[PDB]
Amino acid sequence: SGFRKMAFPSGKVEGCMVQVTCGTTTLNGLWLDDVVYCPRHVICTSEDMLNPNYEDLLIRKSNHNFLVQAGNVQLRVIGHSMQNCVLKLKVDTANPKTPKYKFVRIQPGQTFSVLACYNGSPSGVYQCAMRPNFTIKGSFLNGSCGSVGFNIDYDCVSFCYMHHMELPTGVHAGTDLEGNFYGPFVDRQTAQAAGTDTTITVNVLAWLYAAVINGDRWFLNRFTTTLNDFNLVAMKYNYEPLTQDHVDILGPLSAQTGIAVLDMCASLKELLQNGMNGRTILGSALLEDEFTPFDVVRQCSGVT
Amino acid sequence: SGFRKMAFPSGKVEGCMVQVTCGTTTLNGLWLDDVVYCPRHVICTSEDMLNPNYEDLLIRKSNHNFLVQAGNVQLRVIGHSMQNCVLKLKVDTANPKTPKYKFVRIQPGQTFSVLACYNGSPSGVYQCAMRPNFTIKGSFLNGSCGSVGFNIDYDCVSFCYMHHMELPTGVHAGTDLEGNFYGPFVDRQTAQAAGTDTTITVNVLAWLYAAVINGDRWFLNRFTTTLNDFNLVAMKYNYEPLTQDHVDILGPLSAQTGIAVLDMCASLKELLQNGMNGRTILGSALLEDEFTPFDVVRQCSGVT
Ligand SMILES: COc1cc(Cl)cc(CC(=O)Nc2cnccc2C)c1
Ligand SMILES: COc1cc(Cl)cc(CC(=O)Nc2cnccc2C)c1
């Protein structure tokens, strides 16, 4: 029993963290095989960020200008290229610690572990969700750029996120490992506002099932609802509309608890309309939306 | 910016996780140097747990009865002994992945990362606090026993906790790495109730400073208080009494924000007496007490 915002073990990702320096800028790099991936804004100075011409800026850089250090040993750069907002620095040594890996572009509402790093060294690990507005609510400071988000399937690390920037609104934006930003964000020091963030309804429902599994059942009521009626209440509270796919994805949790998805929706409807009335669910006084139905099943079954 | 319940990178601890089997019982072991540490209840069967005589039970066991497997390779057991509620299985091979380590018995109110494991394999990592009543609110299932709690100081892992049991109340009890339980708990299937849990006041104050550092200042008021007056309000809300040592420990956070400790206490006093009025602090609708002043400084400065 017990339910926590649990991150994946970070060991396989720590063995990939390197330090990338270009001129006076230092950030984190991800070393896999003979390639180091890092945000392309490493080539910029603070003066360049207002409207950088990355193609022009990169042209004034050669392999020798990119200092790559793994722990305390220097890597020799034999190639360099820009793929969207990431630089791929080809090194002459394959990372002996490269795990089995994939590059995946995650869907909004999905979750992942972040290995926050500074100067190629890991500082901490936490669970995040890609918000419906494609921002992440992480914990990042200057030098954290290049830190990565990932998931693990037994021995395979799926890299989904690379951290690039913090917006003036305090939220975090970044790319997949091919350099494509999640959302409308650009790697430029300009006014950028994220869209309206919604609550991930399927995740809140998944977390209600985790609460039921872990003994917190006070919010269970004698009511039911339909997808259409629930969605009217979801729209008013800026929750993501619930689809039949979401109901299907909640199937394993519904079978484990014996509580129908639409009955759980009715408990959620009453929680939205009436609040928590001072009570808590899984030690929280608000509806948690950063646990997918897969995260709930995983944590409640002990998948290693 | 951003504030998360951040765990330490678990890499150094994953390299120590082994599987210990004794008869029909399988749990996790911690392999450091040529010694594997695991909860002594590994020698019990479900029939023995009502009132086990561990000395008698251990006497019917020999080195060959303890199956220790690290990944997929079998370790040879050349010695075995009971130190309080832990068994120390001496193996003929030193763990090549042993990090620099210490065994520390933590103080209540202090925090640590848990590497939850099943069958010697890590499933996840999360931040915990040793509650004032010496229980932990973790996430553990059957087979999670032997999972460890720890902290890291650059290259040194300080092992503070080994998971042993879940109480009927759904809370978690365990030992330090010398086998001494935190709290009054015994490794026996009997009725055991934890004491009254209090809120770690110095941690809630530390988290209020993190909220101020990260932009959430709505709760800051035009008031102040004294240690004696604040403590009258802390007693009523079952918060730990605030001492001058706690004020001193909050000094670095007070200097960074420019907000005196007693002024922050006054904001907390008003939050206790009036609630959050529907608002949130750092994405939470309740007062968070599982971040020490050291955790706040670390996260807000980027210590790797
Ligand atoms: C000045 O314009 C910038 C533009 C880009 Cl694309 C990147 C940066 C660096 C940056 O945002 N670092 C950072 C990331 N997360 C938390 C905090 C910080 C300070 C700056
Ligand atoms: C039956 O008496 C017991 C006594 C002790 Cl000392 C230990 C156990 C095993 C246990 O508690 N495992 C566990 C730990 N955390 C979460 C869930 C579980 C099921 C059982």
Cα separations (Å) of A216 from A208, A209, A253, A280, B278? 9, 9, 15, 9, 22
* Contact (Cβ atoms closer than 8 angstroms) between residue B137 and residue B112: no
Q: Are residues B26 and B41 in the same domain?
A: yes
Say how far apart CA A163 and CA B75 lie, in whole Å: 41
Q: Are residues B126 and B67 in the same domain?
A: no
Do A139 and B2 lie within an 8 Å CB cutoff?
A: yes
Pairing of strands B156-166, B100-103: parallel
How many Cβ atoms from other residues are within 10 Å of residue A273's Cβ? Answer: 10
Q: Are residues B283 and B253 in the same domain?
A: yes
> Catalytic site residues of A?
41, 145
* Residue A40 near ligand 1, beta carbon < 6 Å: no
Identify the burial level of B142 via C-beta atoms within 10 angstroms of its C-beta, where 0-12 means exposed, 13-18 middle and 19 or more buried: exposed
Q: Are residues A2 and A122 in the same domain?
A: yes
Domain boundary among B149, B177, B197: B197
Q: Are residues B8 and B119 in the same domain?
A: yes
Q: Are residues B8 and B84 in the same domain?
A: no
Q: Please give the interface size between A and B, counted as residue pairs whose CB atoms are below 8 Å apart.
A: 151
Q: Are residues A89 and A126 in the same domain?
A: no
Pairing of strands B35-39, B25-32: antiparallel
Q: Of the candidates A6, A119, A137, which has its C-beta nearest B126's C-beta?
A: A6
Burial profile A65-99: b = 16 or more Cβ within 10 angstroms, e = fewer? ebebbbeeeebebeebeeeebbbbbbbeeebebbb
Contacts of A238 (CB under 8 A, 6+ apart): A196, A197, A198, A199
Say how far apart CA B304 and CA B301 lie, in whole Å: 9
Using a CB-CB distance cutoff of 8 angstroms, which residues of chain B are in contact with residue A26? none
Q: Are residues A7 and A30 in the same domain?
A: no
Do A141 and B117 lie within an 8 Å CB cutoff?
A: no
Q: Are residues A160 and A284 in the same domain?
A: no
Resolution (A): 1.8
- Specify the CATH number for the domain of residue A73: 2.40.10.10
Experimental approach was X-ray
Q: Are residues A95 and A147 in the same domain?
A: no
Q: Are residues A241 and A252 in the same domain?
A: yes
CA of A142 to the centre of ligand 1 (A): 7
Domain boundary among A166, A197, A228: A197
Domains identified in chain A, total number: 3
Backbone angles phi, psi at A210, to 5 degrees: -65, -40
Q: Are residues A104 and A188 in the same domain?
A: yes
* Contact (Cβ atoms closer than 8 angstroms) between residue A58 and residue A82: yes
Extract the tokens encoding B127: 């931040």
Compute the residue count for chain A.
304
- Specify the CATH number for the domain of residue A266: 1.10.1840.10
Cα separations (Å) of B208 from A278, A280, B148, B218? 20, 20, 29, 11
**Of A106, A134, A132, A110, residue with least CA distance to A238:** A132
Say how far apart CA A227 and CA A241 lie, in whole Å: 9
Domain boundary among A69, A99, A129: A99
**The one catalytic residue among B38, B41, B117, B265:** B41
Q: Is the minimum CB–CB distance between B2 and chain A shorter than 8 Å?
A: yes
**Of B223, B238, B233, B217, residue with least CA distance to B281:** B217
Number of alpha carbons in the 13 Å side-chain half-sphere of residue A112: 30
Q: Of the candidates B4, B139, B304, which has its C-beta nearest A126's C-beta?
A: B4
Three-point CA angle A204, A206, A208, nearest 5°: 70
- Residue A238: which domain range? 198-301
Number of alpha carbons in the 13 Å side-chain half-sphere of residue A164: 29
